[PDB]
Design an enzyme around this catalytic site. Sequence first.
Site, PDB file in Angstrom:
ATOM      1  N   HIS A  27      -0.359   5.231  -5.543  1.00  0.00           N
ATOM      2  CA  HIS A  27       0.753   4.290  -5.245  1.00  0.00           C
ATOM      3  C   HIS A  27       0.739   3.266  -6.371  1.00  0.00           C
ATOM      4  O   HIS A  27      -0.033   3.216  -7.277  1.00  0.00           O
ATOM      5  CB  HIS A  27       0.317   3.806  -3.894  1.00  0.00           C
ATOM      6  N   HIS A  60       4.859  -0.863   2.615  1.00  0.00           N
ATOM      7  CA  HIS A  60       3.829  -1.449   1.512  1.00  0.00           C
ATOM      8  C   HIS A  60       3.966  -1.211   0.183  1.00  0.00           C
ATOM      9  O   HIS A  60       3.913  -1.983  -0.655  1.00  0.00           O
ATOM     10  CB  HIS A  60       2.550  -1.492   2.269  1.00  0.00           C
ATOM     11  N   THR A 116      -7.290  -3.638  -2.217  1.00  0.00           N
ATOM     12  CA  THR A 116      -6.547  -4.539  -2.234  1.00  0.00           C
ATOM     13  C   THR A 116      -5.382  -4.852  -1.087  1.00  0.00           C
ATOM     14  O   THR A 116      -4.696  -5.684  -1.303  1.00  0.00           O
ATOM     15  CB  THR A 116      -5.828  -4.557  -3.570  1.00  0.00           C
ATOM     16  N   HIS A 145      -2.217   2.879  -9.038  1.00  0.00           N
ATOM     17  CA  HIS A 145      -3.433   2.926  -8.395  1.00  0.00           C
ATOM     18  C   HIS A 145      -3.878   4.386  -7.967  1.00  0.00           C
ATOM     19  O   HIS A 145      -2.891   5.078  -7.199  1.00  0.00           O
ATOM     20  CB  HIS A 145      -3.814   2.139  -7.141  1.00  0.00           C
ATOM     21  N   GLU A 175      -1.874  -6.415  -9.745  1.00  0.00           N
ATOM     22  CA  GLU A 175      -2.814  -7.167  -9.105  1.00  0.00           C
ATOM     23  C   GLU A 175      -4.150  -7.365  -9.908  1.00  0.00           C
ATOM     24  O   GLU A 175      -4.145  -8.777  -9.866  1.00  0.00           O
ATOM     25  CB  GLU A 175      -3.243  -5.933  -7.878  1.00  0.00           C
ATOM     26  N   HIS A 212       1.938  -1.219  -7.359  1.00  0.00           N
ATOM     27  CA  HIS A 212       2.346  -2.446  -6.896  1.00  0.00           C
ATOM     28  C   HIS A 212       3.142  -2.999  -8.154  1.00  0.00           C
ATOM     29  O   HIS A 212       2.848  -2.660  -9.303  1.00  0.00           O
ATOM     30  CB  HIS A 212       1.028  -3.254  -6.805  1.00  0.00           C
TER      31      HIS A 212
HETATM   32  N1  LIG Z   1      -4.537  -1.042  -3.354  1.00  0.00           N
HETATM   33  S1  LIG Z   1      -5.677   0.080  -3.442  1.00  0.00           S
HETATM   34  O1  LIG Z   1      -6.895  -0.912  -3.339  1.00  0.00           O
HETATM   35  O2  LIG Z   1      -5.905   1.063  -4.233  1.00  0.00           O
HETATM   36  C1  LIG Z   1      -6.084   1.039  -2.025  1.00  0.00           C
HETATM   37  C2  LIG Z   1      -5.513   0.442  -0.688  1.00  0.00           C
HETATM   38  N2  LIG Z   1      -3.956   0.561  -0.960  1.00  0.00           N
HETATM   39  C3  LIG Z   1      -3.219   1.678  -0.747  1.00  0.00           C
HETATM   40  O3  LIG Z   1      -3.801   2.734  -0.808  1.00  0.00           O
HETATM   41  C4  LIG Z   1      -1.619   1.500  -0.599  1.00  0.00           C
HETATM   42  C5  LIG Z   1      -0.953   2.924  -0.315  1.00  0.00           C
HETATM   43  C6  LIG Z   1      -1.418   2.898   1.348  1.00  0.00           C
HETATM   44  C7  LIG Z   1      -1.081   1.807   2.181  1.00  0.00           C
HETATM   45  C8  LIG Z   1      -1.430   1.843   3.584  1.00  0.00           C
HETATM   46  C9  LIG Z   1      -1.926   3.034   4.065  1.00  0.00           C
HETATM   47  O4  LIG Z   1      -2.248   3.158   5.253  1.00  0.00           O
HETATM   48  C10 LIG Z   1      -2.252   4.243   3.141  1.00  0.00           C
HETATM   49 BR1  LIG Z   1      -3.219   5.566   3.507  1.00  0.00          BR
HETATM   50  C11 LIG Z   1      -1.845   3.972   1.824  1.00  0.00           C
HETATM   51  N3  LIG Z   1      -1.323   0.438  -0.812  1.00  0.00           N
HETATM   52  O5  LIG Z   1      -0.003   0.111  -0.655  1.00  0.00           O
HETATM   53 ZN   LIG Z   2      -3.129  -0.454  -4.783  1.00  0.00          ZN
END
Ligand SMILES: NS(=O)(=O)CCNC(=O)/C(Cc1ccc(O)c(Br)c1)=N/O
Ligand SMILES: [Zn+2]
Length: 258
Positions: free
Chosen positions: A92, A62, A196, A117, A104, A94
């Site tokens: 990470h 992702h 998100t 993020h 985003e 986007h």
């Molecule tokens: N976009 S966010 O609202 O900052 C936080 C939610 N998203 C994220 O942490 C990520 C990296 C991630 C994705 C899936 C997972 O199982 C884990 Br652990 C981390 N998105 O790719």
């Molecule tokens: Zn994120």
Amino acid sequence: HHWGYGKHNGPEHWHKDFPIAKGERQSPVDIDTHTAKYDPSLKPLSVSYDQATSLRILNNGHSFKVNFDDSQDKAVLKGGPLDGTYRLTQFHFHWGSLDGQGSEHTVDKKKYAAELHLVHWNTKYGDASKASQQPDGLAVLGIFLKVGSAKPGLQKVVDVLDSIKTKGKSADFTNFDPRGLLPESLDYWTYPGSLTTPPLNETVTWIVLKEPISVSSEQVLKFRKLNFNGEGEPEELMVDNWRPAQPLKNRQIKASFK
Ligand SMILES: NS(=O)(=O)CCNC(=O)/C(Cc1ccc(O)c(Br)c1)=N/O
Ligand SMILES: [Zn+2]
Ligand SMILES: NS(=O)(=O)CCNC(=O)/C(Cc1ccc(O)c(Br)c1)=N/O
Ligand code: NA
């Protein structure tokens, strides 16, 4: 689950598995800079990353993610809209297929090339799992990327992506200093929102910096060489891994600056 970003499994489908997708506190949002109000009650924001201990970098299908040792208060976020101490656990990104999309959050409908993020959890809840379920459990520091001059503090990230091309690949990523990813100014907008990505939990205090960081075309091109697929599966480039802006509903976005 089998969620992603394509026509058949992307953001418009997520609500079937995760009904909170149509909730009252979803992220990201468009930041209307003219409606956001300066809030004199916000305390100073404190980004204390000196003692950060990065560990590994992973392609999870992702995004790519750098994790940190969050077993003690090393790298922490405090102040601003936050009560107490939030511990940095991972970052990470986007990004887009083209330089004019990938973020985003949007600012007056403007989309940036990418968005960073930095994800933190409230230490009053003891672990990041428990924190992820509390309305004040998580804080995400969001930073926009715009294409221009290179960001030296991003280059070490850029250079390891070749070693994690496909889903499931990880590498060592020790001794990385996330301070090198910040802009000069800590002016920000803040609002209550959500993850998100699935499961879309409504448990995030968003802190989105106003000043973007500049990265080079060559740096963002390397993001776009990553793959959504696993090794020895057919190639689908990891691009456009962003959720669009969601309804603001009855929320207020506060500005830290006049
Ligand atoms: N976009 S966010 O609202 O900052 C936080 C939610 N998203 C994220 O942490 C990520 C990296 C991630 C994705 C899936 C997972 O199982 C884990 Br652990 C981390 N998105 O790719
Ligand atoms: Zn994120
Ligand atoms: N050091 S790490 O292993 O990368 C930390 C992994 N945990 C996190 O990023 C989070 C936020 C989060 C991300 C994705 C999710 O689906 C959910 Br729910 C929560 N903890 O709340
Ligand atoms: Na900058």
